[PDB]
Design a binder for this molecule. Structure first.
Ligand SMILES: O=C1CN(/N=C\c2ccc(-c3ccc([N+](=O)[O-])cc3)o2)C(=O)N1
Lengths: 883, 107, 134
């Protein structure tokens, strides 16, 4: 009923760049391993608790932000359903403690080993204590991205990763068919340990502001070639097939003999007898068909992508001859390569430009054929195991193999043209605290740029929107750096683009109402105008320092306070009348940034769209909350996400003549949602959500709803405990439509109710008095908001109805305390309507946890340590279950 | 009566026989995860006494079924507890209590 | 000394204006109005490095003395009698960091030199303010 306070520790998380997800494109083997060796942990370093866990994660929302979050403070592995973890005894996912048993029940103690296994195509995660299995598994994830094997800790921990593949092998034998976790390294990239979703790094000069990162997804390792089914290869192109195939095969043989390859029966170059030294009419058929169809598909895509070939000449092709070779090409059996001359012609630079396109297509085709055959990528080559370290489609390869493919396809194009045949997402807006605004003075701060890209530095009013682009409105005067643009309601060119490592100043004179910028060591000038680049901006209500960071970038904003360490304010600055922004400040300035966590906030009055008007009930009408679009003339339509403002806990954790004998002893509530005419019922989802819901999707449907199940079984089955969990339970309005309605615009109203049983946690739905078939079971002590998500297609969209049915209490009966026995609807002002705000402000903590990551060696694995505590005074809002 | 589930192995053959004053460190939280009492905030052990209860009897037997280094997660039912009246202003009536008792046995 | 002489003369100011238009001089490409003051505005900061921020008080009344149409000898004697009225506000936070920054220079207290630099700075600053409001 009132706000509560406590002391909570800080939590972090570290993952290796071993992204292991898969959708359909050989992105992973399917069965993967994980080893963690915990040497020592100090229980209750500070006097709250000690936190140490291992588990998996997902690159689809797992962003544990230090400080607040969900629940009472810390949010490590075991947060919202994107992550799954397992401590010594329990096993949590989605912020609920599921106790599971294991031999020698104990918390994660010093000198222990924890094993984890991930299995796909039958989604599952299996844990193992040292020498014994665990009695609990997962079965029903919603795989959409790659998985990080992560660990979480509070303070005073000593853990080592044991991914394997080196002299520091696993402490236990993996189950058969499981990868040894040393693969999936994504070549052209090393194996490092990094924190997840960082926004503040410790650089040589101190703090570095870090923008959002960029990582691949599940639909990125799939080899996607060009559509090559219907192009109709002409017989004129069919006549070259064999000659081109023979040329490329003999050049392949030349490249192989460059390593000394000879003709024999067996591979293993130590023997040096791999059979590859025959002409195109003498290879074994299994390779013959593949080689001839490889040349065929090269020509096939050549015709497909365009560049219509033409009959340049034929006498040159007829008179083209072979080339002499030295004695190093003659080999023991007697084969000699026959390289056709290639210096006779040279390709257009456009031809060289698209030389790499068909190389990309050929490598994609190779990957597609290999995955169809049944091979998967591995860091270590293993032909008998059908593993090859070259199955990344094109873009994650290494430059050596890329250049080899370019050389092969370039020589193929050389040969073809020799015979004539002429060929024709979010951003972060860092900002100083609102208490540091200054309305009159002369100040200057020095921004530093390390990586070139999209960044913006300047001044903004205190009431700055954290979602709109910086400078796109009248509340911020900012300066871009990628192209030198003044960015106050426009993109007029101003100055020159910066470089890497230089600084850019930001200088304000509110007495004369001007903002002047400066580059590295000099004051820049506009295209034609003089200095004072903003021409008498209004004072308003002061100004604040603001920095903008793009995707994959870092920054080094310097708000004074270290005038000795400033790289400038001597060449310029102090000669004029100016002072550093934080010259006299013992405490370093704390900053507020933009967080990409979609939170629920009340609808704002006078909103351009989504007008909400509360309506009082009548004798025949219950009280209603309605949503009305106010600008359906030309405005945009977006998938709104709304819920009610108050919770509804499920208790017991341990005509229409209402009869008081039963209505006073029932635990059922009915509230219904009515749709309006014109709005398509197929675009309305009505149901319930939990406080740990954060999904925000433009293509949201019932399929993409977070859902994870846990089966706390035993060795001999014992599937008694097979409960599931989710943060969104609802039904789709498209299933509540008669089969004769599709094909025309509906003109009636469909009302969908919501029936729950607080006594037993049973849920069911009804539509227009007809019982449905879907139902959900919820664990006790669960808060379930009344929620509805709709994509509007009418001026009037939805209308809440806190109605009361026969012998069923209305929502207001359990919405509050004093109305526990009142069989009448009520709509107190607290029960407002809120929508899903995409982003919201947050406070950067003054300090941060100091975690040391290093490679202990080739035997002990990778070392992660932390030896100092850190506490924060939490303020837990109780009805939202967030602090 | 009470639940004697363990969180740490500890050592076994240090049971409190009778009379001796045992030393425990307790963190007490209500249902729903809400916490009301924790001696770790004051950094002072409770210095539990046996026989002359002056405490909740459920907590008494929960601590009795413990030994050195054996952290116990007690699940005291609202029968051997503050009862149907509860502690006014702190513990609402008729609620289970969760305890995190760790015995140090400084005697 | 050239800039003040341009300001403290009538023929000097009009001759420059009559010279640019007659010869069709650009006077804008070289800057990438437009007169001698362009160089002064681009060289005042380096000449201001000897201002000795503890003498910022001195530069206040010195400009007003120049507003009295007093000669160089008059202001030199005027400042010579105010040597005791230096800054001496080291306890204030406004001059606290300025003193440290001055002491941190990589380069190098005679009263004759002190009175010479303040008067020279005042003459440039005073006439600049006279033309700062056209
Ligand atoms: O990965 C392998 C496979 N293999 N031997 C089997 C075959 C069959 C066809 C080819 C083949 C590969 C590449 C190109 N090319 O680059 O035009 C041309 C033919 O190899 C082998 O020794 N390394």
């Amino acid at each position: 009923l009132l706000l509560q306070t406590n002391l909570i520790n800080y939590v972090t998380s570290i993952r290796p760049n071993i992204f292991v997800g898969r959708a359909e494109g050989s992105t992973q083997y399917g069965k993967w391993y994980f080893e963690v060796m915990v040497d020592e942990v100090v229980p209750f370093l500070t006097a709250q608790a000690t936190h140490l866990r291992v588990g998996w994660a997902l690159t689809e929302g797992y962003s544990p932000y230090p400080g607040g979050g969900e629940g009472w403070g810390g949010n490590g592995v075991g947060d919202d359903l994107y992550s799954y973890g397992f401590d010594g005894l329990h096993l949590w996912t989605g912020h609920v403690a599921r106790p599971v048993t294991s031999p020698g029940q104990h918390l994660l103690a010093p000198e222990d080993v924890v094993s984890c296994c991930l299995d796909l195509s039958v989604p599952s995660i299996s844990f193992r204590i040292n020498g014994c299995p665990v009695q609990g598994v997962f079965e029903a994830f919603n795989l959409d991205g790659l998985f990080f094997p992560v660990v979480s800790f509070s303070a005073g921990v000593k853990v080592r990763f044991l991914l394997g593949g080196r002299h520091g092998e696993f402490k236990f034998l993996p189950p058969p068919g499981y990868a040894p976790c040393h693969e999936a390294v994504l070549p052209r990239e090393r194996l490092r340990l990094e924190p997840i979703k960082e926004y503040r790094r410790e650089g040589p000069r101190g703090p570095h502001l870090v923008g959002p990162s960029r990582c691949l997804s599940h639909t990125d390792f799939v080899p996607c070639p060009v559509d090559t089914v219907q192009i109709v290869l002409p017989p004129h192109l069919e006549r070259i097939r064999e000659k081109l195939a023979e040329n490329i095969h003999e050049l392949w043989a030349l490249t192989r003999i460059e390593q000394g390859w000879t003709y024999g029966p067996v591979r293993d170059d130590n023997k040096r007898l791999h059979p590859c030294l025959v002409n195109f009419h003498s290879l074994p058929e299994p390779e013959r068909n593949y080689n001839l169809q490889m040349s065929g598909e090269t020509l096939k895509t050549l015709l497909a992508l365009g560049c219509h070939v033409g009959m340049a000449d034929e006498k040159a092709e007829d008179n083209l001859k072979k080339t002499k070779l030295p004695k190093t090409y003659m080999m023991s059996n007697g084969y000699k390569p026959a390289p056709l001359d290639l210096s006779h012609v040279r390709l257009t630079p456009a031809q060289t430009t698209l030389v790499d396109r068909l190389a990309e297509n050929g490598h994609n085709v190779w990957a597609r054929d290999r995955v169809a055959q049944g091979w998967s990528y591995s860091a270590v080559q293993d032909i008998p195991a059908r593993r090859n370290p070259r199955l990344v489609p094109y873009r994650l390869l290494d430059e050596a193999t890329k250049r080899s493919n370019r050389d092969s396809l370039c020589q193929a194009v050389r040969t073809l043209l020799g015979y004539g045949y002429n060929i024709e997402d979010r951003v972060r807006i860092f900002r100083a605290e609102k208490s540091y605004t200054v309305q009159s003075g002369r100040w200057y701060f020095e921004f530093e740029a390390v990586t070139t890209g999209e960044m913006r530095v300047g001044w903004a009013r205190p009431e700055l929107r954290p979602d709109v682009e910086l400078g796109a409105d009248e509340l911020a005067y900012v300066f871009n750096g990628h192209r030198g643009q003044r960015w106050h309601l426009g993109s007029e060119p101003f100055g020159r683009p910066w470089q890497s490592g230089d600084v850019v100043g930001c200088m304000i004179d509110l007495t004369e109402n001007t903002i002047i910028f400066t580059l590295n060591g000099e004051v820049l000038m506009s295209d034609s105008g003089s200095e004072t680049a903003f021409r008498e901006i209004e004072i308003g209500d002061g100004f604040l320092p603001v920095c903008s960071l793009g995707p994959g970038q870092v920054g080094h904003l310097n708000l004074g306070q270290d005038v000795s360490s400033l790289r400038f304010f001597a060449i310029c600055g102090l000669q004029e009348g100016f002072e550093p922004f934080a010259i006299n400040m013992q405490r370093p300035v704390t900053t507020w940034f933009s967080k990409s966590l979609p939170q629920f906030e009340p609808v704002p009055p006078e909103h351009p769209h989504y007008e909400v008007a509360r309506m009082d009930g009548t004798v025949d009408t219950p009280p209603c909350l309605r949503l009305a679009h106010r600008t359906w003339g030309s405005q945009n339509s977006l998938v709104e996400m709304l819920f009610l403002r108050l919770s509804l806990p499920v208790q017991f954790h341990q005509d229409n003549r209402d009869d008081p004998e039963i209505i006073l002893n029932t635990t059922t509530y009915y509230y219904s949602v009515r749709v309006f005419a014109g709005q398509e019922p197929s675009c309305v989802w009505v149901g319930w959500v939990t406080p740990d819901y954060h999904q925000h999707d433009m293509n949201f449907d019932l399929s993409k709803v977070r859902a994870v199940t846990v089966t706390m079984g035993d060795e001999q089955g014992n599937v008694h405990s097979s409960l599931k969990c989710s943060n969104c339970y609802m039904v789709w309005g498209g299933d509540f439509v008669s089969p004769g309605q599709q094909g025309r615009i509906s003109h009636t109203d469909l009302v969908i109710g919501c029936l729950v049983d607080l006594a037993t946690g049973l849920m069911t739905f009804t539509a227009n008095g007809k019982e449905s078939n879907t139902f959900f079971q919820v664990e006790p002590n669960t808060k379930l908001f009344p929620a509805v998500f709709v994509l509007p297609t009418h001026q009037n969209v939805i209308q809440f109805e806190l109605g009361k049915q026969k012998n069923i209490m209305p929502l207001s009966a359990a919405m509050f305390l004093s109305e526990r026995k009142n069989p009448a609807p009520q709509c107190p002002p607290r029960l407002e309507v809120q929508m899903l705000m995409p982003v919201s402000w947050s406070r950067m903590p003054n300090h941060f946890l100091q975690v040391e990551t290093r490679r202990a060696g080739e035997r002990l694995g990778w070392a992660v340590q932390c030896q100092d505590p850190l506490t924060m005074m939490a303020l837990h809002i109780p009805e939202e279950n967030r602090c | 009566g009470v639940e004697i589930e363990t969180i740490s192995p500890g050592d076994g053959r240090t049971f409190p026989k009778k009379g001796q004053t045992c030393v425990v460190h307790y963190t007490g939280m209500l249902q729903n995860g809400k916490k009301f009492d924790s001696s770790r905030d004051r950094n002072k052990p409770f210095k539990f006494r046996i026989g002359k209860q002056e405490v909740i009897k459920g907590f008494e037997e929960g601590a009795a079924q413990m030994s050195l280094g054996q952290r116990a997660k007690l699940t005291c039912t609202p029968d051997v507890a503050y009862g149907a009246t509860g502690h006014p202003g702190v513990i609402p009536p008729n609620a289970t209590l969760i305890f995190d008792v760790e015995l140090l046995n400084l005697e | 000394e050239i800039f003040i002489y341009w300001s403290k003369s009538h023929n000097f100011k009009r001759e420059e204006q009559n010279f640019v238009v007659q010869n069709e001089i650009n006077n804008m490409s070289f800057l990438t109005t437009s007169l001698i003051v362009a160089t002064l505005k681009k060289m005042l900061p380096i000449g201001l490095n000897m201002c000795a921020p503890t003498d910022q008080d001195l530069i206040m009344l010195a400009k007003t003395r120049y507003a009295l149409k007093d000669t160089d000898e008059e202001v030199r004697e005027f400042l010579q009698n105010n040597l005791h009225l230096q800054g001496k506000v080291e306890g204030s936070p406004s001059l606290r960091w300025q003193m440290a920054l001055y002491r941190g220079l990589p380069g190098r207290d005679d009263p004759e030199k002190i009175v010479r630099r303040v008067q020279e700075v005042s003459a440039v600053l005073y006439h600049l303010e006279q033309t700062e409001h056209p």
